[PDB]
């Protein structure tokens, strides 16, 4: 029985309305719940969905060099596979294996609609509008490592800003954009940015294009007997249009903007 780690982010994984009446994997619904079921059915294994204990995607602690988040759950044996919007990055590939991507994304900028910011460079050259990103995720790592002048300027500001411009959850980032009256911009992936832009109260927007181009992948620990079969499953699901089907199922709700 394969232990799956994932993260409670709508629309990937959500508690069903009647979850108290249900058990095990039946408590959950969403894109990654369906994807887990499809991967398991194609590979022929039983599995148990679990929510990442520390709530994080995953970064290497600068002091202890210990990985946290879903990455750490794989590296140190709490889970066998991660099925989540987990970004494929070279630093993470040092310690875990990824499938080919099942969804594309890029780093992007979220603002309150009407805020006078058109680009990363616009953000970088001012301080009235604070801006930041998620702790222990791939976007913070991207900015920390970037040698692009604009992005390094942004990092130099973010890493030393007080009070902190970083958030612990993606929902907190979005809430801070909304609560700040245009005085906070959140650096987050284009998936969440566009998903939120389409939903009530319809007060946020993605500005400029994306800052990079990456993907989400299914992750396994190095040496896992599962890696090969999981990668083949993702490729077949993609080819068969199942990933398109899951996006069409989970991305668009009734009663949203427009
Ligand atoms: C549609 C939808 C709804 C909610 C959440 C998501 C996934 N997601 N969107 N943005 C992020 C994100 O932004 N900066 C980061 O660091 C991460 C995390 C990143 N994916 C990582 O692996 O570290 N993660 C997508």
Curated annotation (Swiss-Prot):
Processing and modification events after translation: Palmitoylated. Depalmitoylated upon L-glutamate stimulation. Ubiquitinated by RNF167, leading to its degradation.
Conditions for induction: Down-regulated in the pyramidal cell layer of CA1 in the hippocampus by global ischemia.
Disulfide bond annotation, renumbered to this chain: 202-257
Residues annotated for L-glutamate binding in this entry: 85, 87, 92, 138-139, 189
Residues the UniProt record annotates as site (Crucial to convey clamshell closure to channel opening): 117
Extracellular compartment spans: 116-258
Annotated site residue numbers, Interaction with the cone snail toxin Con-ikot-ikot: 60, 144, 236
Intracellular or extracellular location(s): Cell membrane; Postsynaptic cell membrane; Postsynaptic density membrane
Known tissue expression: Detected in forebrain. Detected in dendrites of neuronal cells. Expressed in the pyramidal cell layers of CA1 and CA3 and in the granule cell layer of the dentate gyrus.
Function: Ionotropic glutamate receptor that functions as a ligand-gated cation channel, gated by L-glutamate and glutamatergic agonists such as alpha-amino-3-hydroxy-5-methyl-4-isoxazolepropionic acid (AMPA), quisqualic acid, and kainic acid. L-glutamate acts as an excitatory neurotransmitter at many synapses in the central nervous system and plays an important role in fast excitatory synaptic transmission.
Annotated family: Belongs to the glutamate-gated ion channel (TC 1.A.10.1) family. GRIA2 subfamily.
Anything else known: The postsynaptic actions of L-glutamate are mediated by a variety of receptors that are named according to their selective agonists. This receptor binds AMPA (quisqualate) > L-glutamate > kainate.
Record-given protein name: Glutamate receptor 2
Origin species: Rattus norvegicus (Rat)
Taxonomic lineage: Eukaryota, Metazoa, Chordata, Craniata, Vertebrata
Portion of the full-length sequence here: 415 to 795 of 883
